[PDB]
Swiss-Prot record:
Coiled coil: none annotated. Nuclear transcriptional activator of viral gene expression, that is essential for viral transcription from the LTR promoter and replication. Acts as a sequence-specific molecular adapter, directing components of the cellular transcription machinery to the viral RNA to promote processive transcription elongation by the RNA polymerase II (RNA pol II) complex, thereby increasing the level of full-length transcripts. Tat binds to a hairpin structure at the 5'-end of all nascent viral mRNAs referred to as the transactivation responsive RNA element (TAR RNA) in a CCNT1-independent mode. A motif (Nuclear localization signal and RNA-binding (TAR)) lies at residues 1-14. It comes from the Viruses. It is found in: Host nucleus, Host nucleolus. Binds to bovine CCNT1/cyclin-T1. Also binds human, equine and mouse CCNT1. The gene is tat. Residues 1-14 have a biased composition (Basic residues). This is Protein Tat. Belongs to the lentiviruses Tat family. It comes from Bovine immunodeficiency virus (strain R29). The sequence shown is that of isolate R29-127.
Length: 14
RNA sequence: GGCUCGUGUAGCUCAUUAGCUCCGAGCC
């Protein structure tokens, strides 16, 4: 179950 | 100052494949 953004416009998956 | 990236023994919610919270570093 990933983490799409990381808050105020960041980018990761898992 | 901005742009991009880090699972960080990091946090939040719903069985998902994304969005929301903060902060650190490099490059231009």
């Amino acid at each position: 179950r990933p983490r799409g953004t990381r808050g105020k416009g960041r980018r990761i998956r898992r």
